[PDB]
Amino acid sequence: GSSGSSGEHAPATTGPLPSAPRDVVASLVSTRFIKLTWRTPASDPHGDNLTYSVFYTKEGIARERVENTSHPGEMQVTIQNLMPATVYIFRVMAQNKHGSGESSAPLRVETQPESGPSSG
């Protein structure tokens, strides 16, 4: 999106920003992924004109990856390509014509210990 660059995170003129979503919870916890589910943010009761970004990162790790909801307004999203029996901090955030507002609270989600190699 015509991204830019800076030297010292120089300040830039921008309008107001929304507020992270609420009721941030995991509808389901898979061994290779985790189902997330949240409600509309106070700033946007419809959050239909703003996308939602989910940042996941192992407890302690700073390197986190963002996952844009396949579709805007989706009050739910799935995070595949995860490790079983491993804690992960999921953070949901809203995004509108402006950009990234506030990052929801860090949700501690722990996957389940896969069955293992034995197919059985």
Which residue has 């989910």 as its token pair? 54
Please state the domain count of the chain.
1
Structure tokens at 64: 């986190």
Q: What separation in angstroms does the CA of 39 have from each of 34, 58, 63, 66, 112?
A: 17, 24, 26, 19, 25
Experimental method: NMR
Please list, in sequence order, all residues whose beta carbon lies within 8 angstroms of the beta carbon of residue 120, skipping any fewer than 6 positions away.
Answer: none
Residue-range definition of the domain harbouring residue 13: 1-120
d(CA 48, CA 29) in angstroms, rounded, equals: 25
The CATH number that applies at residue 87 is 2.60.40.10
